[PDB]
Design a protein around this ligand. Structure first.
Ligand SMILES: Cc1[nH+]cc(COP(=O)(O)O)c(C[NH2+][C@H]2C[C@@H](C(=O)[O-])C[C@H]2C=O)c1[O-]
Ligand SMILES: Cc1[nH+]cc(COP(=O)(O)O)c(C[NH2+][C@H]2C[C@@H](C(=O)[O-])C[C@H]2C=O)c1[O-]
Lengths: 403, 403
């Protein structure tokens, strides 16, 4: 029966050192709760960066996976499977776009959007071959490929990682005058932006930012790519975070909770005039659109809809933020978020930091992760109930006030 | 009860047109066989580009997936799960490298290898920041990211897809004098190469090519990255295709059959002096190393070992190629491959092509895919038996000789 310490040391030996995780070794998860190898129980306040919006191992999603794995799991796209088309019709009708392109990981959805933007740039907009530019916001995080780190302003992402992808320009987040300036160049094909920046520390832009982005993109014939990989699927209290301002992006990226954490599924949504710039043989993925992922994804979306999780995230979010704001201003300097995507900023000294807070939260039965040594994310599954939420808030209060 | 035609038309409407698949709509798979929605039974001679080496829905691998999905599926790498370390110890000991870095898709494993090569280049070799070059072989295929298409010589991969990643140089495959010439530049960090090129049409290099590559890489202080995503895990009749020449690459990429097609799992293997150039916070993936994928991967490897599939692939491969060589030289111009990774080249006219052959193979109960209009791949699951193989060969003979 391996201990928590055994688990840590074994990984140190045989695995890459590309992470420094919070020292907790989990073996079971159900709904809002996680259990470690010692049998200790925890509130999950990370939800695997929104991948388990439905709670850990939601029985509807598990039943879909169990049913389909006995039938067929992977043919490759060399042939048709019977599930993919059913999934495609369902998701396209739900989000109201003509088409979906299926992939596996969030970064793959991002790479696909970049490819679409360029191909649309050259074939429709009329940009001269390989002059196409994509604009990004500072603080952006969309993954770990050579392309994705090329748009990052985080030195931990890019430093040491070889020459960078050309054609990627960076402007400040939440800055309409900067976007307006950037879009004067007719060689800009697109702007990719997160409606709230997750990894940057739940950076919520000013009211009107999303409608301003939509207006500028349309005016200058530029694609608006919304990365809703973390913000989508009910986490902020709507189907999409862009719904708060009734904004329709050209391209929508989804991932994470698209499978309830059971399978790496991601999706790129857009209309025919953009989607069909990519011809047969010009893009894909071995596992993209496989029948098992598709069955899981259908069930995952059905859960979000059936259980009205968006409404729940909105209602409980307000409660969470209001209670967090009662913590002393000397210790917690800001509270931010929408729905159940939230964070606090702590008054870090050399004595005390976000890591130390998260260690004590763990000791008191709640799992959260810091994102810069002063930021702590609070993001439980959307299936959490009010009494469960208030019990969690009591843990958070006990912990913060115990210093 | 949707028909095959319904399935095709539904995808045409709601899905991207990034594929033109063989018109067959599958709903069930078990071992070597696939069933379409009409109930027709087929030999799978593609094996999802080697992802289902173990056969479709292998019960040992399915049982691992079913057992673990009830426990825990995804925590993210913000915390530890109990499975990952067990998987890491197992795979590292099996292939005899210090460490593994887990990812999901084949292209992600490739991106990771490129990142390692660059970081090792700058930090160990002493290359000036962002002068690091990676060399690739013409005909290479490692995925569909902006980086991956940047090394491709296939216009269908790269054309229309925006400016390219700098620092990627291309030489002819199976060409030691060319490698020797390329490696004169001290800014080369690595050479990435497939031991047999899969997507290029099962291009088998000359005997001694792999040992020559190893010798040149060592001499010029350059990393040898072997992409065994398709060739690895028993498909060619050894654990790794590089085993045929007793060659130890610096970095080994694995994917596909690493999960038996049940889950997108991929792996990057290397020793500490390379692996540890990447520090905590500098690389990762949401789903990489999740407990469900790990349980599946352990079971998938155990199958390959337990059932001696490598030995089986070697024995049956010889039989397959010898029988294929009996087809008239006027109609089939070449037979090539190792183990159960094989292909034929047909004497394409304007009357007749690889697509037409694969349509008739399907009609006669065997599923294969063409790769250039003159090349047809023959790659059944490694669990196939001799009598099953000979029955398949009879289908292939009937089809070819029916024109
Ligand atoms: C908005 C958005 N867009 C694309 C992606 C790429 O998604 P993916 O990882 O599936 O490629 C992500 C993933 N965010 C992660 C990755 C992670 C790790 O441990 O690697 C830390 C974490 C916190 O933000 C994302 O938030
Ligand atoms: C040696 C090697 N190295 C890396 C990868 C990337 O793997 P991945 O797709 O998981 O990113 C592959 C995948 N080969 C595929 C992809 C495919 C599709 O339909 O996309 C057609 C097919 C035929 O070769 C590979 O053979």
């Amino acid at each position: 029966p391996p201990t928590s310490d055994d688990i840590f040391e074994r990984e140190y030996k045989y695995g890459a050192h590309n992470y420094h995780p919070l020292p907790v070794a989990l073996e079971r998860g159900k709904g809002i709760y996680l259990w470690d190898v010692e049998g200790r129980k925890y509130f999950d306040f990370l939800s695997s960066y929104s991948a388990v919006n439905q709670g850990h191992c939601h029985p509807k999603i598990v039943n879909a996976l169990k049913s389909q794995v006995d039938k067929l799991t992977l043919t490759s796209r060399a042939f048709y499977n019977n599930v993919l088309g059913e999934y495609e019709e369902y998701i396209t009708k739900l989000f109201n776009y003509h088409k979906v392109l299926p992939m596996n990981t969030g970064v793959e959805a991002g790479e696909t959007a970049c490819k679409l933007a360029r191909k649309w740039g050259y074939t429709v907009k009329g940009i001269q071959k390989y002059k196409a530019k994509i604009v990004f916001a500072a603080g952006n995080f969309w993954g770990r490929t050579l392309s994705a780190i090329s748009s990052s302003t985080d030195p931990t992402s890019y430093d040491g990682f070889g020459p960078f992808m050309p054609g990627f320009d960076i402007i400040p987040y939440n800055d309409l005058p900067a976007l307006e300036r950037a879009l004067q160049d007719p060689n800009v094909a697109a702007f990719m932006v997160e409606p709230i920046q997750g990894e940057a520390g739940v950076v919520v832009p000013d009211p009107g930012y999303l409608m301003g982005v939509r207006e500028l993109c349309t005016r200058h014939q530029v694609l608006f790519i919304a990365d809703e990989i973390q913000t989508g699927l009910a986490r902020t209290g709507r189907w999409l975070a862009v719904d708060y301002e009734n904004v329709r992006p050209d391209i929508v990226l989804l991932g994470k909770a698209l499978s309830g954490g059971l399978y790496p599924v991601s999706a790129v949504l857009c209309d025919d005039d953009i989607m069909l710039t990519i011809k047969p043989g010009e893009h894909g993925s071995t596992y993209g659109g496989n029948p098992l992922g598709c069955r899981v994804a259908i069930a995952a979306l059905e859960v979000l809809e059936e259980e009205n999780l968006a409404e729940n995230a909105d209602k409980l979010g307000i409660i969470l933020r209001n209670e967090l704001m009662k913590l002393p201003s000397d210790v917690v300097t800001a509270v931010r978020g929408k729905g159940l995507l939230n964070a606090i900023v702590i008054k870090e000294t050399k004595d005390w930091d976000a890591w130390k807070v998260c260690l004590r939260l763990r000791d008191n039965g709640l799992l959260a992760k810091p994102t810069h040594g002063d930021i702590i994310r609070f993001a439980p599954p959307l299936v959490i109930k009010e009494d469960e939420l208030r019990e969690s808030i009591e843990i958070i209060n006990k912990t913060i006030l115990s210093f």
